[PDB]
Amino acid sequence: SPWFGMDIGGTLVKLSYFEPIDITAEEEQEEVESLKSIRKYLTSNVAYGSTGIRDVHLELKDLTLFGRRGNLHFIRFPTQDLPTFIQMGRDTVLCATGGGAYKFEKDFRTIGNLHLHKLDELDCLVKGLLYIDSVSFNGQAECYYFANASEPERCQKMPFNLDDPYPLLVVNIGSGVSILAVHSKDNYKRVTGTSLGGGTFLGLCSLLTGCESFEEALEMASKGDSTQADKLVRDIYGGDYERFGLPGWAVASSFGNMIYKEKRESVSKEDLARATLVTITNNIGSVARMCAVNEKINRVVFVGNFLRVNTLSMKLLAYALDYWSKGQLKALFLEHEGYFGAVGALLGLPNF
Amino acid sequence: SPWFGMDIGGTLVKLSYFEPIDITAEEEQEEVESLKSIRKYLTSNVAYGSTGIRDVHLELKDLTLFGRRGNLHFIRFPTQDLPTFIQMGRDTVLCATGGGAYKFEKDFRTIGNLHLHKLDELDCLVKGLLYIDSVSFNGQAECYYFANASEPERCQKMPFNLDDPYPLLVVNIGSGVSILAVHSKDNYKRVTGTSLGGGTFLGLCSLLTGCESFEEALEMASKGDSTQADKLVRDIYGGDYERFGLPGWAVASSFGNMIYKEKRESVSKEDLARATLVTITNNIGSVARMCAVNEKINRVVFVGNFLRVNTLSMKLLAYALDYWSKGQLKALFLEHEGYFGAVGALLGLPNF
Numbered sequence A, B: 001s002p003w004f005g006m007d008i009g010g011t012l013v014k015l016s017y018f019e020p021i022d023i024t025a026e027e028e029q030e031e032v033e034s035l036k037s038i039r040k041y042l043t044s045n046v047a048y049g050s051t052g053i054r055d056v057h058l059e060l061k062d063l064t065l066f067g068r069r070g071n072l073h074f075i076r077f078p079t080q081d082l083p084t085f086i087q088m089g090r091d092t093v094l095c096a097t098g099g100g101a102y103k104f105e106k107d108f109r110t111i112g113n114l115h116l117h118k119l120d121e122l123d124c125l126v127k128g129l130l131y132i133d134s135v136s137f138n139g140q141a142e143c144y145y146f147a148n149a150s151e152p153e154r155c156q157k158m159p160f161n162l163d164d165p166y167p168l169l170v171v172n173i174g175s176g177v178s179i180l181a182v183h184s185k186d187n188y189k190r191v192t193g194t195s196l197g198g199g200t201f202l203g204l205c206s207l208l209t210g211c212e213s214f215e216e217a218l219e220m221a222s223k224g225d226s227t228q229a230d231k232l233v234r235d236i237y238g239g240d241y242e243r244f245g246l247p248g249w250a251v252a253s254s255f256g257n258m259i260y261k262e263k264r265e266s267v268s269k270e271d272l273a274r275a276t277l278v279t280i281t282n283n284i285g286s287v288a289r290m291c292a293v294n295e296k297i298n299r300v301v302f303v304g305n306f307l308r309v310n311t312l313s314m315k316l317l318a319y320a321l322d323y324w325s326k327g328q329l330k331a332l333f334l335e336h337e338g339y340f341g342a343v344g345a346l347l348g349l350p351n352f
């Protein structure tokens, strides 16, 4: 049967699909038409229906997996459209993770003889992240950081080696945020989480601006000035708060200048989108910083789809984590964004 | 001259005023008319102008201070109205703290011969909190907690003894949030802060609901259901996330159900006010919890005017801190709310 792993999150479904490329002459004969149809559909289209997308740039080419060679594909669609997916499937051993592996278990079982194996969303995240870094991104580093993140004229993406990845703090920014302390391949802990995550960005942005997609919210934020909404240290002190080393540009109160009616009447949607992005991103960085200090871990890797096509938040995390930790913590990022749980689920197939 | 301490914050000015009650016969004669006018104005009115308020219920009666007996009064007004206050003063040694002691230093000096002494906002907070607990609230405890905070039929305010108050984590929830680790009367550190504070509650509430006061925002929140806006663990899993002990009712994504247009169209202003309150309150509790764990401190006292007339947030902090710490941390509260910096500033008078 086809080799899939699926991570059904609170907002997005992520699917990893292994396309064999070593199909012999006899194997092609023995391939049933429904299976050939699935493989050709997945590999000849980059858009599936109105809301599924194959992230072609992430494809791992000529990967050896379970003793076969193939291409590993990365596909996403909204969890809201899982009914379309399941209806397509009804018209296979599925390793599935995320909350939706449990929430929609009975729905997957409407597919006759389908064998669903539910796997833990954070176990799959850790296994998938370690796996992808181990095999490399087609010979390039999977992990990167922003060098000189405090100096815009210098700041640039650069590769980072994770060959000995432990210990590692993993900050998974999805709908909500989970924070993991990883001590070895089989020893990690969920330190805590925060509810101020990607769904808070998208939900608050939607309420405040009328945006109707994540991409629109980011486009608005790129044009906005968060300081039109936020109350800064310099708005309270007139300058720095010197005694505790707080710069005047630091945010004292997110959205705190919106207590003034005349400021609410002048602020733009773009300013509000950027203030929402800045508020959520700084809170994630600060929680990660406190967790790293307590866990005695100095490498913090941020993953999850809050950061897909979101260089603004990545650079803010890189700058803020470095600044507020006095250079003791380093922000790291991974090219495969939000797909690690789906890969980790796929990697569970040999156990069944 | 009159004995005042003033804390000029990012949103509110707090004023502590000592009314002498041991005025002799000769002292009354030597009292100049402008001074008698100030004392009678302050003690015969509970509303000053359109926006100043004396919190009569907080008055400390027959306090011995600087060798005299008197009543200690607690007065607040918006920082936006400090121009009215200074104009009243122009038509004295002022110990002043908060950011506004610096921001408005030149304005205070428009009052002829006035001597301004700027004091640190967190030093004054610590000194004032320790002082008020030491003298008691007219014989009652200044500090309280909520007993049995997880059981609504039992939950009740009860006094707490701080006679040996160290160590103590102090969470100051003003416009922004400062977190202090207090080891002795003269040894404390500002552990960190968060920008998601009282100004975020009021500013976001105002944007989302059109409320035009803090009190209106709380009234709205009391009628709302935050789960109409928030995405809960049970919305993602269908139930608890058992592996990591996350109950289905926990918030996975604040405002995370507002990514759906039809839910934005059905949610009420009251629901949005309550979701704003819950989001900000849980984040403050969680940051306090992480700081307490790292500082090895098990008593966390929450102060600042985000919590004035705000039993909803106090009870949520008491429940959440107890729940998420597995009973290892206790939330404490103080009757004098947001006045500690103003008292601490007053206590600096003998140094000048």
Ligand SMILES: Nc1ncnc2c1ncn2[C@@H]1O[C@H](COP(=O)(O)OP(=O)(O)NP(=O)(O)O)[C@@H](O)[C@H]1O
Residues within 6 Å of the ligand: A062, A063, A064, A065, A134, A135, A136, A139
């Ligand atoms: N399964 C895989 N498929 C494709 N490329 C891989 C895979 N695993 C690792 N790689 C990449 O290819 C490189 C060589 O891997 P590999 O052929 O396993 O040699 P090796 O690991 O150095 N020695 P060994 O594992 O003992 O045979 C690695 O450094 C990765 O960059």
Ligand SMILES: Nc1ncnc2c1ncn2[C@@H]1O[C@H](COP(=O)(O)OP(=O)(O)NP(=O)(O)O)[C@@H](O)[C@H]1O
Residues within 6 Å of the ligand: A008, A009, A010, A011, A012, A013, A098, A099, A173, A174, A175, A176, A177, A197, A198, A199, A200, A201, A202, A214, A304, A305, A306, A307, A308, A338, B236, B252
């Ligand atoms: N096309 C998109 N649609 C919706 N959200 C997007 C999209 N692209 C990026 N995002 C962001 O990515 C977040 C979801 O990230 P993701 O890691 O896929 O979470 P999830 O697994 O669905 N949720 P969770 O159950 O909390 O693990 C959203 O909250 C958005 O901030």
Ligand SMILES: Nc1ncnc2c1ncn2[C@@H]1O[C@H](COP(=O)(O)OP(=O)(O)NP(=O)(O)O)[C@@H](O)[C@H]1O
Residues within 6 Å of the ligand: B062, B063, B064, B065, B134, B135, B136, B139
């Ligand atoms: N300055 C004060 N003015 C009014 N009441 C006070 C003051 N200081 C403390 N109190 C309260 O009054 C009680 C008695 O205080 P006090 O008269 O100082 O006796 P004491 O502290 O027990 N002994 P001592 O300080 O050595 O003279 C305290 O426990 C407080 O509740």
Ligand SMILES: Nc1ncnc2c1ncn2[C@@H]1O[C@H](COP(=O)(O)OP(=O)(O)NP(=O)(O)O)[C@@H](O)[C@H]1O
Residues within 6 Å of the ligand: A236, A252, B008, B009, B010, B011, B012, B013, B098, B099, B173, B174, B175, B176, B177, B197, B198, B199, B200, B201, B202, B214, B304, B305, B306, B307, B308, B338
């Ligand atoms: N009447 C009120 N007007 C405005 N805000 C109020 C009022 N009553 C309570 N609040 C809340 O109290 C918060 C301000 O608390 P407060 O401790 O006085 O901060 P501040 O000292 O002015 N600010 P900061 O400079 O950050 O210390 C506001 O953000 C509101 O959430």
Ligand SMILES: C[C@@H](CO)c1ccc(CC(=O)N2CCN(c3ccc(C#N)nn3)CC2)cc1
Residues within 6 Å of the ligand: A010, A174, A175, A176, A177, A178, A192, A193, A194, A195, B233, B236, B241, B246, B250, B251, B252, B253, B282, B283, B284, B285, B286, B287, B289, B317, B320, B321, B322, B324
């Ligand atoms: C799995 C993923 C799905 O989306 C996810 C679930 C839940 C959460 C939230 C989370 O993990 N939480 C723990 C820490 N929480 C608090 C709250 C108050 C106090 C105090 N006082 N302490 N901790 C909030 C929720 C994220 C991601």
Ligand SMILES: C[C@@H](CO)c1ccc(CC(=O)N2CCN(c3ccc(C#N)nn3)CC2)cc1
Residues within 6 Å of the ligand: A233, A236, A241, A246, A250, A251, A252, A253, A282, A283, A284, A285, A286, A287, A289, A317, A320, A321, A322, A324, B010, B174, B175, B176, B177, B178, B192, B193, B194, B195
């Ligand atoms: C004095 C008072 C006035 O209102 C006040 C000032 C400032 C603040 C905010 C504060 O103290 N901050 C420190 C911690 N911050 C971050 C941000 C990102 C990362 C990472 N990565 N780490 N830390 C945010 C601001 C509160 C109160």
Ligand SMILES: [Mg+2]
Residues within 6 Å of the ligand: A007, A009, A010, A098, A121, A174, A175, A341
């Ligand atoms: Mg997820």
Ligand SMILES: [Mg+2]
Residues within 6 Å of the ligand: none
């Ligand atoms: Mg090898």
Ligand SMILES: [Mg+2]
Residues within 6 Å of the ligand: B007, B009, B010, B098, B121, B174, B175, B341
């Ligand atoms: Mg203050």
Ligand SMILES: [Mg+2]
Residues within 6 Å of the ligand: none
């Ligand atoms: Mg005594």
